[PDB]
């Protein structure tokens, strides 16, 4: 899986429709290849640290994987 660790200043994305909780996040690559790009998404600027949740079924009510990692 992705597993990407966020860097300082990096955009991170959650989906208000599908995230199990507010800490559930995707890196830009996964977000842009996910169903969530068509949903009510939210972007935050990373302070660094933390990681992409692509592929975690516990993190997403729908569409846990992006097209690249599925």
């Amino acid at each position: 899986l992705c597993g990407r660790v966020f860097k300082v200043g990096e955009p991170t994305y959650s989906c208000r429709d599908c995230a199990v909780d507010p800490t559930c996040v995707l890196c830009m690559e996964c977000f842009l290849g996910s169903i969530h790009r068509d949903h009510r998404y939210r972007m935050t600027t990373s302070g660094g640290g933390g990681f992409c949740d692509c592929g975690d079924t516990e993190a997403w009510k729908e569409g846990p994987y992006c097209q690249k990692h599925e």
Partner: peptide
Amino acid sequence: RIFS
């Protein structure tokens, strides 16, 4: 998840 976001940094914890």
